[PDB]
Design a protein around this ligand. Structure first.
Ligand SMILES: CC(=O)N[C@@H]1[C@@H](O[C@@H]2O[C@H](CO)[C@H](O)[C@H](O)[C@H]2O)[C@@H](O)[C@@H](CO)O[C@@H]1O
Ligand SMILES: CC(=O)N[C@@H]1[C@@H](O[C@@H]2O[C@H](CO)[C@H](O)[C@H](O)[C@H]2O)[C@@H](O)[C@@H](CO)O[C@@H]1O
Ligand SMILES: CC(=O)N[C@@H]1[C@@H](O[C@@H]2O[C@H](CO)[C@H](O)[C@H](O)[C@H]2O)[C@@H](O)[C@@H](CO)O[C@@H]1O
Ligand SMILES: CC(=O)N[C@@H]1[C@@H](O[C@@H]2O[C@H](CO)[C@H](O)[C@H](O)[C@H]2O)[C@@H](O)[C@@H](CO)O[C@@H]1O
Lengths: 133, 16, 16, 133, 16, 133, 133, 16
């Protein structure tokens, strides 16, 4: 897939991503906070179509991501992120996608998710997270 | 504790 | 050592 | 003066500010780096005119600010920043303005100046700096 | 806001 | 179990922990680096015996932990860490314990593991990690 | 003088240093906080005697240093720190020593002083400060 | 890049 790297910002206001209950996670675009103002980052699209879009608008700054988890599995022979669920201090969004494969979780006791990077082809290949106080 | 990233700020200089 | 601010990066997840 | 707060970014690519060899420092606008791309912040202008503009373009990222110093004094009864000099790992820019009053210096052994905030009326009233690794 | 330095803490793992 | 919190230090020089190939992870004691000198933290022991001790001495500072993974499962009805493997930029230590249950992994692209906290009774109940630049 | 570097800790509980109202600042020893417990660092003594010792015990953690200032000047031809005053969110300790020479100040809007390094011969030659969130 | 934690250091003051 095509690699991407949003970099680091001051927080997260909204997350938009696609999913297919038959396959895996597709594209994604994040709206970060940048010193008090919304900042929409580059849209990272899937090479294909047929996904359902989910939009998660956080009640910034009172609401922030407290945990990220999901499953990684193989689709058409490619190892991709098949499901995602975001836990907030207010509520839980997900899971979305196929919860089959190897699970993973990143609970946070102290700190903030402040950026994303990764790779997307037909589906989300992999991703990493920026952390900060 | 909120979703705003904290920063180290030094200063100000201008009232000395 | 340059003028680029460093960040803590955790991951990736997607090759497991 | 009118207070301002640029917030924090990933670095500094260019600094633009005014000065009057008779009075003090005037307005200023900073071009920060934001995850590898130039980001021009709000222009913070003086309430008056008659200044000389100085533009400092840093050879980002090989060149970064290593020290900031200057003098604070009174002009027309107001306590303001009358002079500024920026020390880089490559060279020294300044001093600019009137080097009269109380000197101040912020040498940095490890770390980066990553943002500015302060207040400007007729002249730069005061400022603070964001620091980060 | 006090005199104790803050840290980034990830976890826990052990109740899954 | 009894909760513990080593706090944060400047790095890690050595990790000592117990494991039982039949049950789960037992006690553990970490030797941190503190501004260039070894600092042995409190020993956090299991409520029982019958474990094998493993000592991982890192070639500090050239060698540092690059990834932590393992499995969490139930033993005698308690949810505990049953296995652990530490990936270093030099080599891999593990896995140790029973690799049965829910896997978890914490790969690090940039940053250092600089402290531990958690709970230990008969076995390691759970743990969290301190991260830092 | 002999250089020293305490490194970084979790805070400051107490500061002990000497001063001579005729000359400059002498030795100094800091009692840091280390993850909730007192940690006394190496005593950095002056090459001579005849100083007055001042002990500043902070009401940790409710009380923390909010600003550091002083004067640097020449004594017997050596450029040293001649005076020091510590501003806390609770009160002001100082100034101590001779307030003659070039003043300097390090006010902190957000952040904590978490360590010291520098050099001491007959008097405090120079020092730097560790900052952290 | 090693296993030593980095810190923000400001200064020194004493050669002015
Ligand atoms: C050309 C392209 O990007 N194809 C996408 C796949 O990417 C390839 O993946 C293989 C290994 O799986 C290898 O890394 C190639 O270098 C890379 O191009 C992959 O992202 C899939 C799954 O989303 O979509 C496209 O096929
Ligand atoms: C109206 C205004 O902003 N005037 C500017 C001055 O600001 C004033 O300063 C005084 C104390 O000096 C006080 O803080 C007032 O609240 C504030 O408005 C000041 O910035 C001067 C110097 O640049 O310029 C204008 O006069
Ligand atoms: C008394 C004690 O610490 N017992 C240990 C267990 O701890 C208990 O766990 C239960 C839920 O599992 C509950 O949290 C109790 O408050 C707590 O005391 C547990 O740590 C097990 C597994 O190692 O060992 C002892 O039994
Ligand atoms: C031997 C020694 O440490 N003497 C102390 C001085 O240190 C010297 O300073 C000079 C320049 O001033 C130069 O840096 C030498 O390398 C260094 O040894 C100095 O610290 C004074 C002032 O406190 O005390 C001793 O003389």
């Amino acid at each position: 897939g095509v690699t991407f790297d949003d970099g680091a910002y001051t927080g997260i206001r909204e997350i938009n991503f696609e999913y297919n209950s038959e396959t895996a996670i597709g594209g994604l675009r994040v709206t970060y906070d940048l010193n008090g103002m919304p900042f929409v980052a580059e849209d990272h699209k899937s090479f294909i179509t047929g996904f359902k879009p989910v939009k998660i608008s956080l009640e910034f700054p009172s609401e922030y991501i407290v945990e990220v988890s999901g499953y990684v599995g193989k689709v058409e022979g490619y190892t991709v992120i098949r499901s995602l669920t975001f836990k907030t201090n207010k509520q839980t969004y997900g899971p979305y996608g196929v919860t089959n494969g190897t699970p993973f979780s990143l609970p946070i006791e102290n700190g903030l998710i402040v950026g994303f990077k990764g790779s997307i082809g037909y589906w989300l290949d992999y991703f990493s997270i920026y952390l900060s106080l | 504790r909120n979703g705003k990233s904290q920063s180290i700020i030094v200063g100000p200089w201008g009232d000395r």
